Every structure is written in structure tokens, then in C-alpha cells.
From a paper:
A recent study showed that A. baumannii upregulates production of an outer membrane lipoprotein, which we designate BonA, in response to challenge with polymyxins. Analyses through X-ray crystallography, small-angle X-ray scattering, electron microscopy, and multiangle light scattering demonstrate that BonA has a dual BON (Bacterial OsmY and Nodulation) domain architecture and forms a decamer via an unusual oligomerization mechanism. BonA from A. baumannii is a member of a diverse family of dual-BON domain outer membrane lipoproteins. We demonstrate that BonA is anchored to the outer membrane where it plays a role in maintaining membrane structure and is required for twitching motility.
Author numbering:
A (entry chain A), B (entry chain A): 9 to 151
């Protein structure tokens, strides 16, 4: 029961964001040990109707208030660029920024993905971009 | 500068979720004092491209780990019911559950809103539902 021991004290030191879009979950945030990072993934994967989980939680101290506000501003800037985009729609992707990493998740076609990649290069205050896009034009695997 | 004093210590005691959909922001979570709750709203409202902010942060202790996992499961259950719904689409609303309160936000027409209300009555483990829906069929105000 090591991953449950003193869970309350460890979670008080944590920030855990759980964001779902369709049946895919993005985990971001900060926890004090790898046991809690894995527990969060295990617990989310066990939820009904969850298909895939992307666990980008880090093991380390919680980020500062100014960081989450800067992160939110990056996300707001990205959403504004998306609703202005020619092809890709703002409704079709989830956008989250955690500690300067811009995450974009959703289901798009190839034309929409190319537009999205063009938009994301225009976002400031981003150290890394992680796209989690399922291309709906990909042929399904054979039986 | 009372709302900034010892901000780092106060934010360590906090959970602040900032979720945007189109140009509307939902704030949920827990902070130790009303000054931080108001500061979060002021800082989010100041971001470029933010039109409306719904501040549902509470002043109190951070919720437990088991609570955020139960909350996520409510959200996952709601998303599953939405993608099965006849009229309303899962892509058109943002769903978030915080401490047993189900928040649904987005832009819908009347038919989609009626379907949504039918779906939300079928979600368990919810003490309160807060819909933040803009009905796109509402006539715009006169000049
Ligand atoms: Zn879906
Ligand atoms: Zn894994
Ligand atoms: Zn992944
Ligand atoms: Zn987010
Ligand atoms: Zn929009
Ligand atoms: Zn206010
Ligand atoms: Zn409101
Ligand atoms: Zn949420």
C-alpha cells in the first residue's frame, strides 16, 4: 500500500489536472513522488468510458501562481488564434498549458492538422508543444 | 497589496482550475481567503481574448484526492452520455465537476439545450448542476 500511504499529505503538495475530450484523458500537474503519478493514471484508466490516458504529470514541486496565470494566458492566446484559423475549428481541440508546455488534443483530419500546426508555431511563451491528435483520415487497422 | 501578500504560501494551500471554452472561462477550486478568489478572477479577466468569467472558486480547504477522482468519474460518465445523445453533441460543451458540482458550459441551440437537460438528469453522484449555456438562437440585443 505504498502508493496510498499518507495520500492526504502527498496530495496537499500536488496539483493534478484531469481533462477529458471525447474518451481520451490528459493528466498534467505536479506530484511529490512517482507512486502518486502512477496512482492517478491507474485510477483514471479504471473509469468507465475512458479509452486512452496521456500522463504528463511531473514529479516535483507544484508550480507557482504566476506560472498557472501565464499558462492560462497561453491557452487563451491559442484559442483566439484557433477561432480565427481558416480550416481548424476551435470546437474540435482541447487546449491546456502546464508549466509552459502547450498540449493540444482532439480528432482532426489532415487539412485541419496542417492548419493547427501552422497556428501553434505562432504562440508565444511556450517551451514545448505536445500534440495529441488522432487523424480521423487514418485507415482503421485490418481485423 | 493585501491580495498579493504571502501569495506563494496561500497558493500552496489552493486548487485553482482555469478552463476556457470559446472566449468564456470557468474558474473552480478552493482557496484560503476571498482575496485570492478575487485576484484569480481579476487576473483571468485581464487576459486578451477573454469575454466572460464564471468564478465558482470556493473559500475553504482543498478537496481530497478521492474527491477529485470521483469528480473526474462524474465528468467521464457525463461525456459518455453526451456522445450517445440524440441531439446535443459531445464536442459542443465543456464538462467539469468540482466537489460534486457538475458544470456544463458552451454554445447550443434550443433543441440541443433540451436534450442536454435530459442527459444531465441521468448523471449520478452530483449534488448540484450549474449550466452555463449561451443559447445561440436568442435574438441579439438591439443597437
Ligand atoms: Zn466524441
Ligand atoms: Zn503508463
Ligand atoms: Zn501519450
Ligand atoms: Zn486546462
Ligand atoms: Zn468559439
Ligand atoms: Zn465578480
Ligand atoms: Zn456566472
Ligand atoms: Zn475540468
Amino acid at each position: 500500500n505504498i502508493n496510498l500511504y499518507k495520500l492526504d499529505q502527498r496530495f496537499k503538495q500536488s496539483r493534478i489536472n484531469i481533462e477529458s475530450f471525447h474518451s481520451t484523458v490528459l493528466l498534467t500537474g505536479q506530484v511529490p513522488d512517482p507512486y502518486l503519478k502512477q496512482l492517478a493514471e491507474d485510477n483514471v484508466k479504471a473509469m468507465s468510458d475512458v479509452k486512452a490516458v496521456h500522463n504528463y504529470i511531473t514529479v516535483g514541486n507544484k508550480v507557482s501562481y504566476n506560472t498557472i496565470m501565464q499558462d492560462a494566458g497561453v491557452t487563451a492566446n491559442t484559442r483566439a488564434l484557433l477561432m480565427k484559423a481558416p480550416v481548424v475549428s476551435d470546437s474540435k481541440v482541447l487546449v491546456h498549458t502546464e508549466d509552459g508546455v502547450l498540449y493540444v488534443m482532439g480528432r482532426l483530419n489532415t487539412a485541419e492538422i496542417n492548419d493547427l500546426n501552422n497556428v501553434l508555431q505562432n504562440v508565444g511563451n511556450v517551451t514545448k508543444i505536445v500534440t495529441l491528435i488522432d487523424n480521423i483520415d487514418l485507415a482503421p487497422a485490418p481485423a
